Structures are given as C-alpha cells and as structure tokens.
Symmetry: D2
Subunit: 198 residues, 4 copies
Amino acid sequence: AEYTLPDLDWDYGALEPHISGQINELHHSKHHATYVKGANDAVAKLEEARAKEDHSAILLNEKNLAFNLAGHVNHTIWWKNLSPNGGDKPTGELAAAIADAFGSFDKFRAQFHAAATTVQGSGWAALGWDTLGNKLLIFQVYDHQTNFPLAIVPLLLLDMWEHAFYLQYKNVKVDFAKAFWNVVNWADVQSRYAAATS
Amino acid sequence: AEYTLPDLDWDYGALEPHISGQINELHHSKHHATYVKGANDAVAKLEEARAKEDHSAILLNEKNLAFNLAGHVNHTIWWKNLSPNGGDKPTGELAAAIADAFGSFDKFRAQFHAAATTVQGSGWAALGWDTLGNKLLIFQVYDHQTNFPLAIVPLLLLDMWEHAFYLQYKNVKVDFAKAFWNVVNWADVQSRYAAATS
Amino acid sequence: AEYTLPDLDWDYGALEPHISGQINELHHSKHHATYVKGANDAVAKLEEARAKEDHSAILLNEKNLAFNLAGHVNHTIWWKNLSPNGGDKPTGELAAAIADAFGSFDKFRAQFHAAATTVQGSGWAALGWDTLGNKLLIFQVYDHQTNFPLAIVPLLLLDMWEHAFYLQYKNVKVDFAKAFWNVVNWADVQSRYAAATS
Amino acid sequence: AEYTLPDLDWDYGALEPHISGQINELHHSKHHATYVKGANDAVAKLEEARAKEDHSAILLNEKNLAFNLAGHVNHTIWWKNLSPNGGDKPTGELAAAIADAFGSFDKFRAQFHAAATTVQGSGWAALGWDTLGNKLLIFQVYDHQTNFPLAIVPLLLLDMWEHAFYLQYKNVKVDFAKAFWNVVNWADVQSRYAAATS
Ligand SMILES: [Fe+3]
Ligand SMILES: [Fe+3]
Ligand SMILES: [Fe+3]
Ligand SMILES: [Fe+3]
C-alpha cells in the first residue's frame, strides 16, 4: 500500500535537552510528511506514464522517486534509532561486532563523528552492513540517496541536514553531533544487526 | 575477508553476437578488477586512519569506499544476470510480480529501457525490491552509487557506462539496450526475487 | 593574494523584517568565513602537493577547492545583491533584457521562484548570462558548485541552504523566497549585467 | 540565436596518431551534435513553461538546460584547444603565468594529469582563471556541469568521458591523457588567457 508517516514511540519533547521538542515536531510533522507525500506522488506519476505509454519525463520521475523514497526510508530509521531511555554503549553481539570492525567503540565513534561533520551540503552519517563482503561499514551519504552501494542494510543513521539542528545549535554542528550519542537507541541498532546477519 | 573478482559462469565470447567477447574480457579482467582493488584499498585506508586516529581525509575515504564498493557490487550482479541460455521472458512468481507492479512485461521493459537510455553520464538501469513498502521498483542509478534508497535489494541491472558497449555499438546505446534482452538470465532474477521477498 | 571575507555595505539588522539580523550575523560571520578559510586551505594544500610531487589526494583537494571557492564566490555576490534601499523592479536595459528573455518581469519571477523552492537538498536559484549563446538564463545550482556551465557570469543569486532562513521562517521556504524580492539590489544586478554584456 | 554545431578547423584525421579520425568523427558528428540539440530543446521547453505558466517540471528543465549547455560549451572549447600543428610548450605571458601559478610547466602537467585520470565516472580536467582571486587554477569537473565555481573562464580542457578514447586506447586512459600533450593548441590557450585577464 501507500507510504505512511510513522508514529513516534515518544513525545516530541522526550529527547530534551539533547534534541529540542520544537525540532522534533517540525522535523516529524513537516519535513518527514513531505517526503512521504513525495514518494506517494512519484509512484503515482510512474503508474500514469506506464498507462499513457509516455516516458519523456523518466529522468524527473526516477529522481523524485529516489529522493523522496530515500528521505522516507532515512527518517523512518532515524525515529527508531532514537530514545529517551537511550545512550550509554552497545552490549553483546553488536558491541563485539563493532570493536572487531572498528578497533573499539571509541574508534567507531570518532569515524562516525568525522563522517557526520564533514558533509559538504545536506547529508547523513550511516552505519550499515555489507552483505557482499559481510562487513560493518560507515558511509557518508549526500542528501538522502547518494554515496553508498546497493543492498547495504542501514543500522544507525545521524541526520546532518541543517533542519535537524539549526534552531537549537545554529551553526555548531559538532555540538549536535556530540549530543546525539546521548539519545541513541542501541536496542534498535542491535535488532537491525541481528536481522542483517540472519 | 577481502573483496575478490568473481569467475564468470561462461566463456568471454558466449554472449555473441549481442555482447562481444572483446568487451566481456576488458570489462571483466580490467574494469571490474579495478573496482575490486579500489574497494580493498579503501577498507585498508580506513583501518589506517582509525589506527593513527586521523580522519582528515574522511571525505575522500568514504567516497573511495562507496564508489569502488558499488562498482564491485554492481558488476558482480551483472555477470550473474547474464547468460548464453538466456532471453525469453520471466515465468512464475516473478512474471506475475512484474505484471502486477508494471502493468505487463512489455510495460516493464519500456520503462527499464527509458531509464537505461536517458542517463546523463555513466549509470545503470536497475530493477530493485523496496523492503519498506514491499514493492518492485525501477531505479536510474548515476555512476555506481547515486540515486536510489538504502536497503533496496537489486534484482536485474543493465550497465550503461560507455565501456559496456562502445567498442561494439559505438554511440548507438539503444541498440545495445535492446540486445540485452536476449541475454538476461531470468533464473537468476527469479532467485534474487525469492530471497528478497523471503 | 588570499581570499578574504568581504565587509557588508549595511548593518546586520538592516534587512528586517525580511531577513533577520540574527541570520545575517551567523551567515556572514560564521558560514561565509568558513568557506573563505576552506578556500585558502585548499589552495595551500595544492601548493604542497605540487612541492612534494604527490597527488594521491587530488580528488579530495580538487573537491575542497571547488566547494569552498564556490561557497565563497556565491556568498560574496549574495551580500551585494542585497540592500535596505532595495526592492521594486529593475529599470532600463536590464528591465528590457529580462522581459525579452523571460516574457515579462513577473514571468521571470515565477521561474526563479520555482527554481529556488524545488531544490532537493542545499542549493541556490541563479540568474546568469551565457557568453556562448548571448542569453540570460536561470540555473538551479545544487550545493554551491553543481548544475551549471563553465563561463556563465552570475547576476542575481538566492541562497536556498537551510541556514539562510531556518531560524526565521523554519520550514516555510516559500515565504522566505517571497520576502527576498523586497531586498534585492537591482543597482547591483544592473551593474553586473552591463559588465557581462561588455 | 540557436546553439549551433561548430565546424572543425582541421580534417577528422589530422590528429593521428594521437587521436584517431574515427573518434573525432563520432565525437563531433554524433556526440557534440546531440548536446547542441539538447540545449536547443531545453531553451524551447523553458519558453513553453513560461507561456503556459506551469513550472511543474522546473527541476527536469533546469537539469536538461545545464547538462546539454555544458556539454556544448565544453566540446566547443575542446575543438579549439586541439591542433595538428600543436604540442610543445606554452610561450610568453602564459608560460610565465603557468610557472608562477604551478611552480613549473611540468608541475602543472602532473597536476592536470592526475585530475584527468582520477575522475570516478565521466568528467574532464580543466585549466581555468578565477576572476575573484585573480588566479589560474585546475578543476576536476564531473560529467559536464559539476564541481567548479560560477564565473570561472575555461582556458584548456581535456575530455575524459570514455567515448573520447575508448575505441583507440580502450581502458588505458593514461596513455590517452599522455598523448593529448602532443596536440594542444597553445595559441588558443594563450588567446583565452589574454581575454580572461583583460
Ligand atoms: Fe531530516
Ligand atoms: Fe561496467
Ligand atoms: Fe548561505
Ligand atoms: Fe566528449
């Protein structure tokens, strides 16, 4: 069926003071909803093109599909990766997986922090699992859909688009990237990891 | 372990006359091998950065990782999607899946053909499965890693980079895009689809 | 010599209420300054590479050069295109140039408004002059350096990166794109145009 | 008026054996002509949108305009930068300009060679003049329109898209990048430079 805006598992102001409730409400209710609507529209426009047998706008359609679907995919994961009862460090299989792939938790954190804070434009930092070579890798994503391979399964993501922190941290993106550690939902990341290696 | 260049399941000239053996040997033995080496190098450079605690080149490293890993992922699938005993049309669950998602096999073929022939630069046409909305979608990929969402599982891909057809078809990319139908390995696409919906 | 942060021709709060003084001070003193420093650094890193005869980081260097130099170029023009004693409509040669290239001033405004409000990520709307075909064209620029040809001379630009309006207009980018008309410095655009056609 | 395919100042096979006549004829008569037609079409589609007051396809239109106009601009310069009576080294003001901006002619050549051979996809190496900081810089351009600032004036360009060398050099792009030095038309580069600093 249609793409739908997911409900949050917590109240908008539940992440304060790391992420303000004013940001969570605009981010959720305005930005995310838009990508949901844009993905729904792109799918519909592609159905119409097929019906009318006219693909003169294929480049635009495939671009709208990709951009909005990725916005949609990315924020859906973001809301799940976040929690009021979060923070701390990972435990168990993930904790071992991460120390083995990055050296240590701290070494993973510094690479993820550098990937998140050096984007030249809108982007995200992403922890994903490569099915091909069976490794945990960090990716720096441009906008929502560029700079990563096909078939990677996302585990943890950090939204580095300006709207994610501007009202609260203004231009100091590093402070925002550091506060994030406090609200990560490791239960969720652990779960995704289990699925990905299954 | 390391990324490795896969072996082909057929002789280089087994796809003639649709794809020449001269192209398959350069494509496999030179282009693909390079991406394999580049992915192996990027992984190694990221290990070194972690060791020396220096991420001043993070943007370059994450870009090399993404580009080569995607080149690697993309060609690995390409070789499997191809066969001497191929062509014809899909059968069974896939055949029904495709008619249901695109209208008909022919309607799917025209959209894939338009996506493949309208790239403005290097790119590919890709048939993938969206886990989020549980739909089969076509994506137009730029280079190897741009213009699609995270977590999509690739089913069929058509290499539209110039090196894929230049020696044989020269600038007539449409003739190459049409000959491709003759060598598609539907057994492989079917298999990927089963896995993806499992 | 070195790239330098230009001085404004007006006080930070001189554009209120269309653009808040709080935005002008962060935008100028923090964002722009950064691009100035990044361009200065890239030029220096390229000199070092030449000296040590090592271009293993050429892709990174050319990317840093391009991104920061463009950020620098773009904001430098932005500050000049803005004025407290601005707004209204163009007059003279430009006014005729624009009606001739776009139909009418209003038709130019609607295209520029659509280009500015539909970017999928960070970007700008840009009015430039094509030396090759001697025409005035509108370009939609991605980030600071993508999606336009070489040798185009920029006349008017509208900053659509989130930091340009977020604190004041939040997600309502269209209201920001509409307020801009009130502070455009047509004297400046006219001047650039004369130079470009000279 | 309309964009038009320029005539060459030499016969297609005049650059042998560095660049084959078979490549020059496909490159000129097929690839370039296409960009000319695409630019002419984009300009026309934008006029229609203005007339019908409908900019629902603005993103596509501005992308087609940019891509084809840049293809057009880039190849037009390429044909001029090439000559049968070329090669050797620059002389006079340019020769001094280049040694001053890069160290030496050889140091300029190695950077340009690295920029040309490391593109990850279609691209070009470009020698341009920055009006803002009054410096000669090298840019690595992605496709035809990305990765450089507005207002730069192009002086020398090297086409690194596969179609530029594939038939002759196959995957050995470095040999092609080295043969180019033999056919550069320094008279042309000198001329552009004079204009740019005027
Ligand atoms: Fe966001
Ligand atoms: Fe290929
Ligand atoms: Fe800005
Ligand atoms: Fe070319």
